[PDB]
Amino acid sequence: GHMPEEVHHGEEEVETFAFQAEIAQLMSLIINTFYSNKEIFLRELISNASDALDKIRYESLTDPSKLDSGKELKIDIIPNPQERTLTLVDTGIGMTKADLINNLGTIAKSGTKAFMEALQAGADISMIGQFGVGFYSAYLVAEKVVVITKHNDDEQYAWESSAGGSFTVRADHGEPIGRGTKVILHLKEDQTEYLEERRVKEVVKKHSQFIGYPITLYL
Numbered sequence: 001g002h003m004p005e006e007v008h009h010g011e012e013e014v015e016t017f018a019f020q021a022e023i024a025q026l027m028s029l030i031i032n033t034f035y036s037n038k039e040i041f042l043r044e045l046i047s048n049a050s051d052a053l054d055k056i057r058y059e060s061l062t063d064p065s066k067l068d069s070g071k072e073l074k075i076d077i078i079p080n081p082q083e084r085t086l087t088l089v090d091t092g093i094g095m096t097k098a099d100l101i102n103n104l105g106t107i108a109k110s111g112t113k114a115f116m117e118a119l120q121a122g123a124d125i126s127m128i129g130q131f132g133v134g135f136y137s138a139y140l141v142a143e144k145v146v147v148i149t150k151h152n153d154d155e156q157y158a159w160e161s162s163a164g165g166s167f168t169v170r171a172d173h174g175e176p177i178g179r180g181t182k183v184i185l186h187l188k189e190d191q192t193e194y195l196e197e198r199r200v201k202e203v204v205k206k207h208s209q210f211i212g213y214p215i216t217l218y219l
């Protein structure tokens with residue numbers, strides 16, 4: 001046999017970018033401070049999932065073909081005690097590559113900035129969703145967050161950040177999710193209570209009791 005060397009690939013498959021400084025300041029703030037009620041992170045994710053589900057639901061009024069990718073609108077929650085992850089998957093509208101990079105790395109600048117200003121003036125962490133940036137509350141409990149997303153008009157993409165100032169984005173060739181978003185939280189060691197059935201049930205019942213979509217726990 002011969003030994004080729006592929007000196008160049010079709011396109012750079014992993015890209016790394018810095019957050020806007022304001023986004024990174026918030027993330028650093030969130031991942032390092034004490035908050036007495038970190039369970040709000042699940043409310044924030046379920047809230048973003050509900051909106052993504054509304055978005056595909058309303059386009060399905062006008063185009064029934066937008067669900068050939070999946071007709072059930074639902075949220076699933078999967079704690080995995082042995083890999084210390086908690087996973088939320090929704091069948092909402094998902095995100096193109098352009099919006100993945102933009103929404104999470106860049107145009108969150110306004111909301112994160114107004115929020116840190118509001119914090120200086122007396123706000124607290126639970127109000128983060130009033131500024132459109134509730135997703136970053138995941139770092140209350142996670143040391144590392146992964147986002148897998150699939151929009152009807154694009155391929156599947158993976159996003160990842162450990163809150164070190166940077167994130168990466170790559171074409172994800174993994175479990176095809178069809179459509180929507182999947183979030184994988186790599187939990188801090190002192191936050192393993194969100195891998196128990198009792199507790200996750202408490203948090204959903206306490207905060208997301210009136211979401212208009214089924215939420216299913218896969219213990």
Ligand SMILES: CC(C)c1cc(C(=O)N2Cc3ccccc3C2)c(O)cc1CC#N
Binds near residue numbers: 044049094
């Ligand atoms: C990465 C975060 C921000 C996230 C994004 C989506 C998502 O694809 N959209 C698309 C869309 C369209 C309209 C209104 C809102 C949304 C949010 C999701 O379904 C779940 C999460 C998890 C959290 N928190």
